[PDB]
């Protein structure tokens, strides 16, 4: 590329905006594709920017699934052995990879545990060695860190439900999906409700598929939360990933979920994965995010960008004019109650020592 | 347990006689500051274990445990000897313990470990002129251009902070003199990173809520932290805490390690200190001195609750996770000496 | 044989009735392991658990019970293991298990060592109602001559401030009782609050008698420390969400049906009837957030992250 000027423009973005920093360039197409790109990866990278109610979980999976294709049709260089290259490989994916869609922090870790795996296995075992292993240790991590774990938290978030509660979420989180869906199996008794918002409606399709299993639910959108907050009682949120002070970070409308159901002295029960927490830490809802396209916004209506000749249809070319929207948001722990884990229920700031209760497992 | 119950005072001045020294300079305070407190610490217990004749390990924790005792009468409030100490105490039957392990192969004299204890030590000086280079890393992942943040009283380690994001970002600082005892070394700080090219402006320490209503972010340098998290810090910092909490402004600490004890704020009035009260009224209103009551605090208090952020030489962590670096780094039975 | 260990554990409280109520039952478990002419493991632990329940079971499935029972279980089994002699297990257990209840009723000791310093000269404590820490830190400080005085809450509808009183009067320091409708009155004039534990839960809340968190809050608002005295013996796996979802034996504050018909300043005896009392909670949750400093034999937990980590490390 363009490499240091443009690593420099975005040293140079860092003015009034609030959000000079954060990085808009994408890649939609395959134009100028470079080859050092396996095709599946090419697939999954028009997933990531195309799909769009996918993967708060899914990608993980989707990812490393798709990255066993990559080192099964790897060979290394017969100059220099395996374990000496593999990583230049995947990080030319990854770097195209990021290009479609920045990476999600459960995308991150995992990747940050295969970089490491990659160094520490022994040079004796040859190539179809050292890859029937790498599956292996990749199908144990989906098993173990994320099927597991959804199970055991499914239960566990099950367990503290109630015969007659009436419950909350927000914009289709698989996890807590799986929660109510298995709690109507096993007989409890109850109703949801589900807060959409805009743009791209995520909820909606929560309600279909709670609405398939002949659940009571409630579809109102976000800015009508100060009403129908006084029905509920319990509140469930799927979270992207927790934070090392034991914020929640989600989607945009997270905070005010979490907000209104204190006012409303009703707890913020997050639902997230143990791999999902980061060491990261931040205050603001700023400093570290991730943008969806402004245009996106021009469609007035109740529908995807589809015959809607909005009135801000040309705010690229109006000055002082300019639309926005992040996906992502910090809610502090004041709000949330707790986080369920694998590990169990635990107080969301109990976070980082179970980090470190990793790198005690691995050295 | 201290070591007048163990040694004469003048086998302690004969044997080792640096301890005395130092005990002197500590009452004294010819030596100050926590840095210099931990520094001169160590190299008086490196002499002490580089001339010490014992055989046991079990009397060699006695002695360093009794030792520390009357090194921490002194001046007990300079936490940072006694963190060195019980650091060392871990260090040694943790490292006893993975000896310990290595003799019990098959077998089933015990000491001369000295040069180790030596090279262990010498590993906790290393770090330590090193504390601010690890954390003034950290910065950029918070400062940011046109950022607004507030300090106050000239804390080296959040100079250095600052200055790392100030290379390459512009931004904005509030520096507010840490009067009466700040205020020489907070101007030169001020004076120090506008060079740095940082918009610097230096106030009162009295219109810190004038301005809290427009500030990002407030940085805090501490001079001790205590087993609920508390601060000890630096004279008039409350202010400036409660001025943060009441507009909802997050408030971060960049602070080393050693700093931390897990000494408890049972009486914060066996704490903070009083110093001398020529630095705020002079000797000449003598109708006034001998009128009135004038008090001079050298440091401040504020709880946990009100601390947002940490900022350690060995990451950013939450205060609820400041135990877990203890248990780390400490033994619980070294709390008190 | 061994039958109706109850009367051990029971016979304990005359025994000695300066103790509390789980370190006898620890004592008769021990005993009851003590004359376990046992062949299997699983026979062990399916005595200990057909043996707690049923001692679970004899005494309102109370907390601290329970609290210590299940966690005498999943203390001894930790580091258990078999190997040739089969007596080593029953010598591994008792041995262990000796010095869990050894190491248990030395606790309330260790916490006087440690909250003693927490009262300063002339300082103003409050306490709701009898907690038997709270009485061992107070004494064991003043014996140390310090000058102080604390106000009592009566505690209804247990009424134990009144032993609270006596008990801390017994020992020469001052006392005033208060009625648990006025303690907001009083928190200007403290310095300090220090409440016994009954339970303690995950997330770092407290169980104690009800209008524990009645006070928590005060000294929040009044922006007074509160300070809460926990043997370790007393953590327990629940997590409450709120502060009122808690397992309750009898159904609670239920109301009345009023059909159309007709039945009909110290006013001292206009009271509540015990059936209507009944209807009342004995149990009120503080949520960790109102809990400044929790003292343990442990030592003293602000963290309510580590009140986790050290609970974790407690169920093996």
Known sequence: ?363 | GPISEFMSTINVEHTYPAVSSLIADLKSRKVQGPFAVAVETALVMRQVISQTRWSTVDQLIDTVRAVGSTLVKAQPTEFSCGNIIRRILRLIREEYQELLKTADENEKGGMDMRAVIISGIQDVIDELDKINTDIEVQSMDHLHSNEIILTQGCSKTVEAFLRFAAKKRKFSVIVAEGFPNNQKGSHAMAKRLAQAGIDTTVISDATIFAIMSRVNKVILGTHAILGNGGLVTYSGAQLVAQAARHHATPVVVCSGIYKLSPVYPYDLESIIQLSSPDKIMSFNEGDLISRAEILNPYYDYIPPDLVDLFITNLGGYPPSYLYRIMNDTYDASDTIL | ?316
């Open chain 3, 1 to 316: 044989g061994e039958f109706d260990i109850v009367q051990v554990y029971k016979k304990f409280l005359q025994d000695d009735p300066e103790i509390t109520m789980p370190v006898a039952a620890i004592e008769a478990l021990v005993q009851l392991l003590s004359r376990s002419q046992a062949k299997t493991i699983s026979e062990f632990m399916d005595i200990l658990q057909n043996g707690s329940n049923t001692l679970k079971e004899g005494v309102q499935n109370n907390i601290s019970l329970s609290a210590g029972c299940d966690i005498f279980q999943r203390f001894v089994t930790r580091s258990l293991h078999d190997v040739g002699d089969f007596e080593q297990c029953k010598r591994h257990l008792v041995e262990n298990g000796k010095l869990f209840i050894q190491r248990a009723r030395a606790c309330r000791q260790r916490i006087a060592h440690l909250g003693y310093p927490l009262i300063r000269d002339g300082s103003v404590i409050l306490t709701h109602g009898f907690s038997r820490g709270v009485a061992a830190v107070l004494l064991a400080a003043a014996k140390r001559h310090v000058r102080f005085k604390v106000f009592v809450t009566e505690s209804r509808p247990s009424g134990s401030g009144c032993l609270m009183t006596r008990t801390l009067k017994n020992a020469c320091i001052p006392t005033c009782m208060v009625l648990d409708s006025a303690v907001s009155f009083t928190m200007n004039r403290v310095d300090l609050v220090l409440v016994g534990a009954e339970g303690v839960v995950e997330n770092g809340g407290l169980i104690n008698q009800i209008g524990t968190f009645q006070l928590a809050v005060f000294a929040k608002h009044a922006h007074k420390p509160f300070y809460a005295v926990a043997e370790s013996h007393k953590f327990v796996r629940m997590f409450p969400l709120s502060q009122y979802d808690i397992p309750f034996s009898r159904p609670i504050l239920e109301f009345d049906d009023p059909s159309p018909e007709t039945v009909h300043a110290i006013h001292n005896e206009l009271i509540m009837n015990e059936e209507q009392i009944r209807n009342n909670p004995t149990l009120d949750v503080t949520p960790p957030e109102f809990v400044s400093g929790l003292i343990t034999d442990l030592g003293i937990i602000d963290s309510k992250s580590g009140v986790s980590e050290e609970l974790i490390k407690l169920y093996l």
């Open chain 1, 1 to 363: 590329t363009d490499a240091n000027l443009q690593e420099k423009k975005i040293f140079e973005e860092k003015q009034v905006s609030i959000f000079s920093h954060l990085d808009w360039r994408r890649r939609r197409t395959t134009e100028n594709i470079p080859k050092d790109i396996h095709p599946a990866v090419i697939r999954l990278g028009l997933k990531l920017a195309n799909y769009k109610i996918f993967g708060s979980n899914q990608r993980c999976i989707d990812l490393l699934k798709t990255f066993k294709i990559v080192i099964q049709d790897y060979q290394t260089p017969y100059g220099t052995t395996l374990s000496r290259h593999l990583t230049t490989h995947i990080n030319s994916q990854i770097a195209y990879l990021v290009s479609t869609r920045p990476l999600s922090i459960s995308m991150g870790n995992a990747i940050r545990f295969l970089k490491l795996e990659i160094s520490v296995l022994d040079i004796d075992l040859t190539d179809d060695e050292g890859k029937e292993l790498l599956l292996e240790k990749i199908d144990s991590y989906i098993r173990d860190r994320i099927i597991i774990a959804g199970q055991v938290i499914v239960q566990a978030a099950t367990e503290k439900i109630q015969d007659g509660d009436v419950i909350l979420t927000y914009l289709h989180s698989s996890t807590v999906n799986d929660v109510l869906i298995h709690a109507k199996n096993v007989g409890k008794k109850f109703r949801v409700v589900v807060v959409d918002s805009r743009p791209e409606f995520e909820g909606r399709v929560c309600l279909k598929l709670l609405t398939e299993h002949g659940i009571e639910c409630t579809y109102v959108m976000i800015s009508a939360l100060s009403y129908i907050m006084q029905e509920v009682t319990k509140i469930f949120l799927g979270g992207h990933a927790m934070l090392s002070n034991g914020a929640l970070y989600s989607r945009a409308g997270t905070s005010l979920i979490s907000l209104l159901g204190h006012e409303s002295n009703v707890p913020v029960i997050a639902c997230c994965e143990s791999y999902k927490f980061t060491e990261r830490i931040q205050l603001d809802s700023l400093v570290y995010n991730e943008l969806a396209p402004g245009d996106q916004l021009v469609n007035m209506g109740v529908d995807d960008f589809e015959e809607k000749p909005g009135v801000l249809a040309n705010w690229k070319s109006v000055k002082n004019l300019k639309l926005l929207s992040l996906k992502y948001d910090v809610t502090p722990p004041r709000l949330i109650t707790v986080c369920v884990c694998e590990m169990g229920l635990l107080p969301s700031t109990s976070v980082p020592a179970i980090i470190n209760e990793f790198k005690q497992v691995y050295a």
